[PDB]
Structure formats: C-alpha cells, structure tokens
Design a protein around this ligand. Structure first.
Ligand code: A2G
Ligand code: MG
Ligand code: MG
Ligand code: MG
Ligand code: MG
Ligand code: MG
Ligand code: MG
Ligand code: MG
Ligand code: MG
Ligand code: MG
Ligand code: MG
Ligand code: MG
Ligand code: MG
Ligand code: MG
Ligand code: MG
Ligand code: MG
Ligand code: MG
Ligand code: MG
Ligand code: MG
Ligand code: MG
Ligand code: MG
Ligand code: MG
Ligand code: MG
Ligand code: MG
Ligand code: MG
Ligand code: MG
Ligand code: MG
Ligand code: MG
Ligand code: MG
Ligand code: MG
Ligand code: MG
Ligand code: MG
Ligand code: MG
Ligand code: MG
Ligand code: MG
Ligand code: MG
Ligand code: MG
Ligand code: MG
Ligand code: MG
Ligand code: MG
Ligand code: MG
Ligand code: MG
Ligand code: MG
Ligand code: MG
Ligand code: MG
Ligand code: MG
Ligand code: MG
Ligand code: MG
Ligand code: MG
Ligand code: MG
Ligand code: MG
Ligand code: MG
Ligand code: MG
Ligand code: MG
Ligand code: MG
Ligand code: MG
Ligand code: MG
Ligand code: MG
Ligand code: MG
Ligand code: MG
Ligand code: MG
Ligand code: MG
Ligand code: MG
Ligand code: MG
Ligand code: MG
Ligand code: MG
Ligand code: MG
Ligand code: MG
Lengths: 123, 118, 19, 114, 56, 209
RNA sequence: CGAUGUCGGCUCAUCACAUCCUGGGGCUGAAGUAGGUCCCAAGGGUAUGGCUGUUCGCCAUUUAAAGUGGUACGCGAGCUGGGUUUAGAACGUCGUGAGACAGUUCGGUCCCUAUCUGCCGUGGGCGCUGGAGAACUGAGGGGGGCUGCUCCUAGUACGAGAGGACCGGAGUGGACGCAUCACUGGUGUUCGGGUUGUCAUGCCAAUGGCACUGCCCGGUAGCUAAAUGCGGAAGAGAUAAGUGCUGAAAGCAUCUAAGCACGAAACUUGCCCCGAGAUGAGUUCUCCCUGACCCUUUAAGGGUCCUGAAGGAACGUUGAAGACGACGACGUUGAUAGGCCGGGUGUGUAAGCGCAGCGAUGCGUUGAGCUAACCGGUACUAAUGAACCGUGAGGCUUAACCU
RNA sequence: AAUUCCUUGUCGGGUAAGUUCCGACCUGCACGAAUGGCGUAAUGAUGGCCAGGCUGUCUCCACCCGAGACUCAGUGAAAU
RNA sequence: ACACAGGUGGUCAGGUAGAGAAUACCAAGGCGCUUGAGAGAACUCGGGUGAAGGAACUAGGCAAAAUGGUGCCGUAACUUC
RNA sequence: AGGACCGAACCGACUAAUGUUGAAAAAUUAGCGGAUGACUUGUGGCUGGGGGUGAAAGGCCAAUCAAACCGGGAGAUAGCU
C-alpha cells in the first residue's frame, strides 16, 4: 500500500538502495500501489559505481509491501519492509540481472516473468 | 450508536462506577433491601447476583475473589455464611426491583432492590 | 427608562478595516 | 446460529493437529500453475492463533532471504494441505508480535520439555 | 442571531400547542389494601400486587 | 419471476475444492404461503400476497386473523406482495418453497439497512473534515458553506446535510446464488445483504440479468 | 458611509455552454494510425506535487480529460488570516523636520446561544364522511448515468514500407456510490495478564485504591476501512446534428411540400429510493358495533339511562430502532430484559497446597483460573387482575339492478 | 542586501520539480565608513532555509473515554 | 459589583520513594467545590489508541508526536581559548 | 568566581487551544523565559497635569492618557445631523 512520498527498499542489484514513490500510475486520483502495480520513483540513495544515479526519475514494480497481499481463501502474506524492482521509462523491463528476497504470485503475468525466474522463492 | 452494547455509563467515569457499585453491592448484602434510582438498581443486579452465585461454592479462592470485589470482610462472610446456602437451590434471580415513585429533590425514578427471601 | 451605559469593555474581534 | 453452526461443522477439517503460539510448524500449501498442482512448504514460528471455528486462522513468521515474512493461514482452507509441529516453543503470551522487533540471538525461544 | 421582528402572542401560543401535560391514564387499585397507586409501583403504605413488601 | 421472503441468519464462508473462500449471507427462506391473489378485474394488477414464519395467536389482531382464515393458511410474521409476469399463475394456500431459486444464477436482496441514527455530513455524505489544527476554530467536522450569497439567497432542496442515516429499504442487485438447500430451507448468496441478523429479506431473481 | 467585511486558501457547492474528456456527425491538403476544422450534444466525469500569500504562472510527474464562465470576482452570523488593512521597529528613498512611499523588511486581535425565510432530518394535530387492522396502486419527486488498459476479431482492412484500424465480442482496473462485517485489520478506559512508585486490607501470602486506563502487552461483542460483495447497463420510445427513400411544386433535379426510414452519454422510459395532505386525500382484503327513552328553537338537533365492540393508547420488560417523539419485539396461554446453566471467545498455566533451590524464582497439581456487550438453553427476578380511549349499523340527491 | 524598481536578474548548489534558502557575479533603480563600514566566537520564547528522528498535520479518517449538546424535575437570563 | 476558576506579605514543614520545598502515593488535618436524575445522536470541548504511508498538511511541522535519568566511554567546524 | 549552567518557590508572558452575553472588563489549560541579580517582595515615604515619571512603547500617572480626574467659566460654539 504505497503512495507519493513512500520510501521503498530495492529488491534488485541496480545499485539503488532507497527510492521514493513520486507517482502511482494508471488512474486519475489513484491513491495506492500494491504488489504488481507500477509506480514512478526518484532514487534517494545509490552505490557510487552503479547502473543508476541518485536523483534519477524512472519506473519500479512494487514486489513486497508491509500491508501485503490477500489470496482467494482469505489468507494474507505480509513482509517487514516495502521493496520494488527498478524498470525503464520506455520498455518497463528490469535494469538489474539479480532480484533479492522473495516475491508473490501476483507478478505471474507476461510483463514481470524476469522478476519470477530470477527470484529465489515465490510466495 | 451503541448497537448490542451493555453497561450504563450513569454520567460517571469507569473508576467511579466500579467504586459506587462496590459500595452499593455491600449496602444491599448488609441491609438486604435498599432504595436507589431505578437505572442504578437495574445495573446493581449485574454486580450483586454474580457475588451471590460465586458465594454458592465456599473455597479460599472464591472468598478472595469476592474480597477482590466488595473489599469488605463483613460482606464476604455474609455472602459465604448467610446468603450462599439461602439461595443454594435458586437458579439466579436473587434480587427483586420494586418501583416506588419519584425522589423529591430531582424527580429521579426510584426503586427498592431487595434479596428475594428477605 | 434605560440604565447608565458601561465604560468600554474588551472586544472579541477587530472591526474589519475597509480601505 | 444452529443453522450457521450446521454449515460451519461440515466444511471443518477433523485432522488439525495441536499447535501453540511459539511452536515451529511446517504448513504445506497447494500452488496452482494452470494444470500442475504442487505442494510449497512454509516453515516458521506461530506468532498468533485465531480460534473461531471454521474461521480459525494462525500467523506464521519466517526470515526468508534477509526480509521477514508473515503468512496468515485460514486453518480450514483446502489450500492448506498439512500442518506439522517441527519444534515446541516455551512462551507465556498468546500473541508473539514482540518477535517482529528482534533479530538473531534475541529472536530465539526456549524448547518446551513435556 | 436574533429576531428582526417581535414574534406575536399568536405565534407564542402556537409553539406552546405541544407543551400541555398528559394526566396519568388511570391509577391501579391494589387487591389487598385497596389503595390507588401508579401501575407497576408500590402503594403509599408499601403494598404491591396484594403483598406487604416494605414495613411503613 | 416472483421473489421469496426470508430471514438474514448471518454471514459464513464456503471453501471451494479449488481453494477459494466465498463470503456468503445465509438466508432462511421457509415456506411462503400465498394469502391472496390480485387480478386485473377486482384489484387492478397481477400479484400474489405471501406470508411466512409463525406468530403468537394473541398478537394476531382479528382483522389480520380473518384475512389468513379466508386464505386457509396459518398466520405469518407479515404480508408481502410480488408482481406476476404474463405467464405466471398461483392459487390460494399454495406453499411456495426455496426450490423456486433452483436454476436462478443471480438474485436481488432487498432489506432494511442497519440504523446509524442521526449521522453527521462526514459519515452520511462522505464530506471531507476541515483542518484538525492550523487555527481551525470549532469547525473540524462541520459541513462548511451550505450555499452562495444574495443570489440565490436560499439553500437548494437536496442539499447534503446531517440527518437520519440507514434504517431504510436498500436493494443490493446481482448477487451470485452459491447454494439452494431445500431440506434446511436455506439460500446462500455471495457477499453482504442489507440489515441486522434476524432482519426480513425479500429475494427476487436478477432484474438486470 | 446611524458599516453591504475586503485578496488567496479551506469546506460545501449550484447554474450556463462559447465542450476539456467520453457520445453522434459533415468537410478534409481524411490511405491507415493520428490529426485539422465546423456542426450536434451539458448525462456523467474533469490531477497530485515543488516555488510563491498568491489567483495566476513556471516547473516535475500524472490523466480519458486536468474545460471556459456566472453565482456579492459563490461561500469569514461556515473555518483560516499568509496577502492586504491601525498602533512597534528598521532599510532604501524623499523631506530642514514632524513624517512619508500602490517601495521593502520583522512583529502584530477574526464576536454572535438562530426569531423568520431556506435547507436536512423527525414527530404531534386534524383531514380524507361509521369506526378499525393490514396489503397495495403510483400521480408526482428524488438517486443513479464517469472511464482506462489488456486480449480476441487481426498483424486482418489500409499501406511502398514504417506502421496499423472501423464494426463486434471478452476480461481486468482507476475514480465514485450503496451495503456489509464472513475474512484481513483498527478500536475495544465494561475481558485477561505483565509491571513501576505508594497507601491500605493486623502481618505473611493474597488483593484493592491512586498515579493519563499509572505505564504497558494482548483482546470479546459492537462500531468500523485499509476489509469484500454489489452498482453505472442492456433494451425500448421520441429525437439532435447528420444520413437517406419515394416525390412534385419546377417535364429535369431535389431528404420534403404529401408520404416513408435511420440517427447520440442529451430527452421519455428502463434500474434504485420516497411517495394518496395525489384535499384530484385512490384501490383491495379482513374485522367490529343490529339497545331503550324523553324534550324541542323538528335539526346531519340536544339529553338521560343502558352499553364500551373491533382496535388503540397507557403502563411494564425491552431492541443491531432511536436526540426526544417515532419504529420493532415481548408482558405468565411468557424467552422481552437481567440473572442462571452449558458452550464459545479472550487472556495464558489462578489461589491454595506440595516439591527443588541459601534465595530470587522454577516445577507439579494445570492449558489452570478468570472471562463484557457473543451462541444455545432455562421462568429464578421483573414484565399484574384491572382501569383508560374508542361505540351502538353510519347524511342527502340521482341513477342502474333488486322486491 | 532588513537596501535591487526592472526581477522569479544571471550562473552554480540543494529538490523529481525551489518566486524562498545558500554561494558566486556586479547591471549598487536608490550600500558605504561612530544617524558608523566590514567581520566576529558566544548568546537569542529573534527572521529565513535544509536534514535525521517523530508523528492523525495530511492521504482519510475509524473507534474509544470523559464534559456539554438531547430527555425529565427545580431555578431561570440576553442581544434584538 | 457575585458565596466570582483571578489578586494578596509573613510563619510552621510528618512518612515512603526522590537530588529536592520537584513529582507520585499517604499522615496530622481538611475537603467532594449549593442544581440534580437519565440518555449514550449530530456537533463542540478535553483526552486515549490506530492498518499502510510519514510533512504528501500548511503561509509556516501550527498543533501533535518525539527526546528526556544516572554512570562510564566518546565528542566536529569554529573560537575572543 | 559568575548580570555562569539545569531547575521548584518567586518574578515574568513566546506559542497554541479554550473562553469572547467569559469562571475572568485581560483569564484558564498545556507547553514557555528569568530564577544571586541591571533580581524579587512587604511596609512607609517623595515626584502632580503642558506637569510628573519613563533601560523610550507616546509607555505609565486609580479598569481613564498625543495632556488625568473633579468642580467651575457653561446653556462654550455647532453655516452640521
Ligand atoms: C476589540 O476591538 C477594540 C476596538 O474597539 C480593539 O481593536 C481590540 O483590540 C479588539 N480586540 C480583539 C480581540 O479583536
Ligand atoms: Mg443486549
Ligand atoms: Mg448530568
Ligand atoms: Mg484512574
Ligand atoms: Mg422610554
Ligand atoms: Mg431591518
Ligand atoms: Mg414546547
Ligand atoms: Mg441503530
Ligand atoms: Mg482533506
Ligand atoms: Mg477564538
Ligand atoms: Mg478544535
Ligand atoms: Mg426570491
Ligand atoms: Mg442600519
Ligand atoms: Mg453548442
Ligand atoms: Mg439538462
Ligand atoms: Mg437519460
Ligand atoms: Mg503548482
Ligand atoms: Mg472566485
Ligand atoms: Mg467573493
Ligand atoms: Mg476569507
Ligand atoms: Mg457569509
Ligand atoms: Mg496577515
Ligand atoms: Mg509606525
Ligand atoms: Mg467566526
Ligand atoms: Mg437526478
Ligand atoms: Mg462477528
Ligand atoms: Mg485485532
Ligand atoms: Mg487496548
Ligand atoms: Mg485490567
Ligand atoms: Mg505482601
Ligand atoms: Mg487512597
Ligand atoms: Mg491522593
Ligand atoms: Mg440506449
Ligand atoms: Mg422527381
Ligand atoms: Mg433471559
Ligand atoms: Mg482458549
Ligand atoms: Mg493474578
Ligand atoms: Mg523584488
Ligand atoms: Mg520541502
Ligand atoms: Mg536556480
Ligand atoms: Mg545571496
Ligand atoms: Mg545606511
Ligand atoms: Mg566620516
Ligand atoms: Mg550598528
Ligand atoms: Mg428544564
Ligand atoms: Mg459556589
Ligand atoms: Mg504570592
Ligand atoms: Mg507538589
Ligand atoms: Mg460522547
Ligand atoms: Mg473527542
Ligand atoms: Mg496519542
Ligand atoms: Mg497510523
Ligand atoms: Mg504502524
Ligand atoms: Mg520515516
Ligand atoms: Mg508541502
Ligand atoms: Mg498543498
Ligand atoms: Mg510546536
Ligand atoms: Mg506531547
Ligand atoms: Mg544566571
Ligand atoms: Mg512587563
Ligand atoms: Mg502557565
Ligand atoms: Mg538561564
Ligand atoms: Mg533556570
Ligand atoms: Mg510612534
Ligand atoms: Mg490605566
Ligand atoms: Mg490640550
Ligand atoms: Mg461664557
Ligand atoms: Mg451645549
């Protein structure tokens, strides 16, 4: 349950460590982004030598949230800290070659298949 | 809204209510009949009758529970010596409320609340 | 009749200034 | 009431083992990919149990690849295949939410002996 | 906020058209003593439904 | 076609074999006895009057008793009417059961919504609260402006304001019928319906379907 | 000018249409995609941030779109008080000076208990023609009406390629609305527990008070959103711009004059709610009352005796009903409330006793004890015999049937 | 610039985005040397700006505890 | 002007905890503040708690939340040392 | 040692909310500044109205201040309402 100003950790090796959501895409007055939803992010913290720089404006897919995801039987899956995977402005494909930590069954699309394959565990 | 809620507030805070019903429970057990406001009498039924119920089984534990409530060994003793065997075969309903007009000072609806075998 | 009027007393709000 | 009870007693599992808050259970849940239907194991500490008949639930917390993960299972759900207590924990609380603000040697429970 | 015009004795009357008291429908008569009393209330001498419940 | 009168027993879930939890409202639809048939000649429209449940003989007034007596049916907790389509036809006494919904896929459930009493504009009309701080004087949950100036110099009819909320007739349309149990006289519909537990529900086949 | 509070914001709007989006069209220097321009269309919808008092504007990033105006540049007896708009102070500047500047700078107060209109709710009265309990009809009124993306049709039509449809169908979202509490959660000073200081219950042990519920950890019912069900429609009628058919006036031509057809989120319906004070007061079903007598200004007259129905009210126990009224349930031929019994739920293994330990404490008895608003039961308590209101066959005229 | 009208000057810093802030520049509308000039550690319920922490300030409110509001009895105002 | 939450100099100074005349709970002693009774709507006031987010609020973090004790360790620019 | 530091009494009054026909003609509540000094406070004294006093705000001089209050000139005058 991510909104404008929300600070997300990075679940990839892009070099970005802390990113801030500056928009929820895909609707007028859209409040929140859950697991799977694409957000617009600015990079607040990054490693010195990386694929992305501090202050860069790009897209990210939210892959873990504290609010978590609900399954059809009523079950819920909650994580400790919100994390996202950085995507391009044009293509919306991952920058990184390695995703860190687990992901959910909500990324099982035709759009985030790289973020499933490179995942150690899919909860 | 107060849907399905129990327990009258009686224009008091929780601590005051608890203290007042502790005193008024002792008063009823001591005198066997008292005159109070009708709503206080209806609430009192939910404080005294469990104490009488509790006082059907005479143990150290139950006397300490009934002391934890009431806080008077003149009331505890009477609950476990006099009232306990008295209502032994009676399945609840130890108290009778009798409406008795209106208080002079504030036109409060008044009632007597007495133990049934008084 | 009418009672003697009071001396000025504290006022809650400033008169609006129109200028 | 008796009608809802008579609806909530026929959907109810009869093979739900005894587990307590602080125990380490292994919940095996069904994962569905179109045709194939396999069992995925989720193992961690039982931090909360909701006893509410058919609506019963329990919350299992594990540290999966650095990031802490809490799964709230619906006890009588057909997606939960098997529950199995791997370790019995000695705690004094019903709810172990305090385990959320601990990591390493601090987030350890003493093994209950009979 | 306050009236711009003095309301009439007529308007005053109309507002008080709902102020009239309702007299007790009727008094119950105890079976033993014979006293009139408020229904579901004890009598003045202390009877309720033919039973002497409180002494004086 | 016609609907049935039921009682909201409460809400449960149905776990499906494919591991999905369907939230269900349990509607107790016991035998609906037709107490009167309206025609075009006498009454002036086609409908049946249904009763359901049982009621205390002493509580049943003589103008209600006679009405049931003419129909030759035991008194129910009330009377409801259902309009007929051109093809439909029922008789006096005829006990209609929940088997009526056997093939019906979606229903409309009408009930008396829970009473919220006197509700503010924030709860009733989703009005936005004003600043909690930043100097706000006694105007945190108040409605704000209720009109414009000298033109029009009045508040318009239908102005959203504080007042009675809920305890009114509400219809939730196009609820999936999950199960129809004729033995236990139960109708299970997917999702929530209006009213408290034990409240009267009128259940009709989907008007939109 | 014996005062009509002035910018911007906030809250809440409401109308216009010169239409921003969505809908329907004509022309195109319209291949397609996408545009341009004009016509019709006001149903619904119509950004969040950075900077600034700003409106605005610039910028960032969205969106189907971020419309233009009116409404005392809508809205301070609704909020704010940053700007402006007193008294303090300073800078630049002007002036010998007091002072001054639509130059700047720091500081600087926002009253009103609502009589009337209006509006949102909710009752009482009387009416509706004998009285009464229900169920209705629906005049009329209100609510609702938004839209993205993906997939199929189809890499088809079209195009040199690049690209890439109409029409039709399917799925899944955003925003908004209604309902609900099964789930996920919040709350839960009425449940359980931990714990600090202190005071008390003679003391030990065990408890209670007070310290924001002392501080906390959990949490039942209820209420609830972030939770999860559902909604916008399809269809129909009459149309707008527009498109036609047949067809003269005008041997031709011509959508029009006669006649005929199609045509949109606008209109009338369809969906949801209110609704017979709809005084034009409607309908249907059922229930109740089938006494005597006297005076007179002989009237739809008054009065006495007898009678008091159906139904209602009142009172009581009350309710997921409620400000109060109201509304619903129940009143012994009784589960209406409280208690009580069983269960559940929550807390988490009471007290006492025993055992181990020097002791704090641990272990056993023991998942113990306690457990609100919950579930299922149960007349133990309180819902009383009465009394009270309401009557006694219901006007005239004229028809059509009946005798 | 507590002084700059033009002006949100220009360039850089900080921010995704900075009419404010900071640093330079000098084109000082209209600084300037005891109506002192320029610095200055410390001090400040002083003005401006940025962070960390923190949060119902806000997204967007929900529930709860109390005092009013509501009903009954007693007393009983006011502006106009 | 009131049996008015204001103002009014000196003296006395118990216990437990505490650095303390702070603070909490008490003693001696003194009080419950001269309308009560119900109810448990909106809204106002004074408080408590809050999912996810964390200044996006706003003129401005206004208000709130937060920090908070003792000992030891450790402590920058700058400086009139 | 100190117009030194933290902090009650005591002196003050930066912010906010409340209150605004108030509990109060300037307060209350929560925070806030000083707290051995250019400190604060009791009692009494002195300064008088174009005069006082003023770490200077035209501040204060009995709820009154760009000339106090009371009585008098006085029925000032009022081309104004
Ligand atoms: C009340 O008005 C007087 C003038 O008559 C003063 O302006 C005073 O400062 C005002 N007070 C408030 C609080 O506005
Ligand atoms: Mg109840
Ligand atoms: Mg009171
Ligand atoms: Mg307390
Ligand atoms: Mg006069
Ligand atoms: Mg006037
Ligand atoms: Mg009145
Ligand atoms: Mg209600
Ligand atoms: Mg808001
Ligand atoms: Mg104010
Ligand atoms: Mg406020
Ligand atoms: Mg007019
Ligand atoms: Mg005037
Ligand atoms: Mg037009
Ligand atoms: Mg229109
Ligand atoms: Mg329409
Ligand atoms: Mg902007
Ligand atoms: Mg405007
Ligand atoms: Mg205006
Ligand atoms: Mg304003
Ligand atoms: Mg106004
Ligand atoms: Mg200002
Ligand atoms: Mg000045
Ligand atoms: Mg105001
Ligand atoms: Mg409408
Ligand atoms: Mg429930
Ligand atoms: Mg919870
Ligand atoms: Mg709690
Ligand atoms: Mg407790
Ligand atoms: Mg002890
Ligand atoms: Mg005490
Ligand atoms: Mg004390
Ligand atoms: Mg249509
Ligand atoms: Mg022709
Ligand atoms: Mg009972
Ligand atoms: Mg249990
Ligand atoms: Mg204990
Ligand atoms: Mg300038
Ligand atoms: Mg900022
Ligand atoms: Mg710049
Ligand atoms: Mg500069
Ligand atoms: Mg100078
Ligand atoms: Mg010189
Ligand atoms: Mg100087
Ligand atoms: Mg009164
Ligand atoms: Mg007094
Ligand atoms: Mg003093
Ligand atoms: Mg003290
Ligand atoms: Mg309250
Ligand atoms: Mg409050
Ligand atoms: Mg708090
Ligand atoms: Mg929160
Ligand atoms: Mg949190
Ligand atoms: Mg943070
Ligand atoms: Mg901001
Ligand atoms: Mg803003
Ligand atoms: Mg502050
Ligand atoms: Mg605080
Ligand atoms: Mg000092
Ligand atoms: Mg001073
Ligand atoms: Mg203070
Ligand atoms: Mg100091
Ligand atoms: Mg100090
Ligand atoms: Mg001056
Ligand atoms: Mg003075
Ligand atoms: Mg003079
Ligand atoms: Mg003279
Ligand atoms: Mg004169």
């Amino acid at each position: 349950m991510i909104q404008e100003q929300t600070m997300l950790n990075v679940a990839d090796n892009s070099g970005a460590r802390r990113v801030m959501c500056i928009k929820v895409l895909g609707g007028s007055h859209r409040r929140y982004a859950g697991v799977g939803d694409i957000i617009k992010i600015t990079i607040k913290e990054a490693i010195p030598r990386g694929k992305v720089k501090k202050g860069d404006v790009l897209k990210a897919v939210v892959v873990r949230t504290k609010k978590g995801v609900r399954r059809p039987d009523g079950s819920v899956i909650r994580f400790d800290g919100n994390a996202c995977v950085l995507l391009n402005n044009n293509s919306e494909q991952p920058i990184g070659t390695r995703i860190f930590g687990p992901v959910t069954r909500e990324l099982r699309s035709e759009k985030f298949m790289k973020i499933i394959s490179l995942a150690p565990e899919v909860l | 809204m107060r849907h399905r809620k129990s327990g009258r507030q009686l224009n008091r805070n929780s601590s005051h209510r608890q203290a007042m019903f502790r005193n008024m429970a002792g008063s009823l057990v001591r005198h066997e009949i008292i005159k109070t406001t009708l709503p206080k009498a209806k609430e009192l039924r939910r404080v005294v009758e469990p104490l009488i119920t509790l006082a059907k089984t005479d143990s150290v534990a139950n006397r300490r529970l009934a002391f934890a409530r009431t806080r008077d060994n003149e009331i505890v003793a009477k609950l476990f010596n006099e009232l306990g065997p008295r209502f032994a075969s009676r399945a609840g309903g130890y108290t009778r409320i009798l409406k008795c007009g209106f208080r002079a000072g504030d036109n409060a609806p008044m009632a007597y609340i007495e133990l049934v075998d008084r | 009749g009418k009672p003697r009027p009071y001396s000025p007393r504290p006022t809650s709000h400033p008169r609006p200034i129109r200028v | 009431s008796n009608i809802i009870k008579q609806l909530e007693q026929e959907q109810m599992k009869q093979d739900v083992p005894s587990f307590r808050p602080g125990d380490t259970v292994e919940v095996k849940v069904w994962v569905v990919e179109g045709s194939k239907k396999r069992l995925q194991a989720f193992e961690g500490v039982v931090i909360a149990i909701r006893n509410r008949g058919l609506h019963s639930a329990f919350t299992v917390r594990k540290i999966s690849n650095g990031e802490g993960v809490e799964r709230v299972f619906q006890t009588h759900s057909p997606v939960v295949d098997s529950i199995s207590v791997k370790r019995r924990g000695a705690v004094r609380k019903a709810k172990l939410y305090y385990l959320r603000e601990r990591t390493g040697k601090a987030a350890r429970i003493k093994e209950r002996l009979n | 906020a306050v009236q711009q015009n003095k309301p009439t004795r007529s308007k005053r009357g109309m507002r008080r058209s709902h102020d009239a008291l309702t007299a007790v429908t009727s008094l119950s008569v105890d079976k033993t003593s014979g006293e009139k009393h408020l229904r579901h209330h004890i009598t003045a001498d202390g009877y309720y439904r033919g039973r002497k419940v409180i002494a004086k | 076609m016609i609907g049935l009168v039921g009682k909201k027993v409460g809400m449960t879930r149905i776990f499906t074999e494919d591991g999905v939890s369907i939230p269900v409202t349990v509607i107790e639809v016991e035998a609906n006895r037709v107490t009167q048939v309206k025609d075009l000649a006498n009454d002036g429209y086609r409908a049946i009057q249904v009763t359901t449940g049982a009621k205390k003989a002493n509580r049943v007034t003589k103008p209600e008793a006679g009405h049931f007596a003419k129909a030759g049916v035991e008194a129910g907790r009330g009377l409801w009417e259902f309009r007929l389509a051109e093809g439909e036809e029922f008789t006096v006494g005829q006990s209609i059961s929940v088997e009526l919904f056997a093939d019906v896929k979606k229903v409309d459930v009408t009930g008396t919504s829970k009473g919220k009493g006197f509700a503010g504009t924030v709860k009733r009309w989703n009005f936005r609260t004003q600043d909690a701080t930043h100097g706000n004087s006694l105007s945190h949950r108040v409605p704000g402006s209720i009109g414009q100036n000298q033109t029009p110099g009045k508040v318009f009819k239908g102005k959203k304001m504080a007042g009675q909320m809920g305890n009114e007739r509400v219809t939730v349309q196009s609820l999936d019928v999950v199960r129809v149990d004729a033995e236990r006289n139960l109708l299970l519909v997917k999702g929530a319906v209006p009213g408290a537990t034990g409240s009267d529900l009128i259940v009709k086949p989907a008007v939109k379907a």
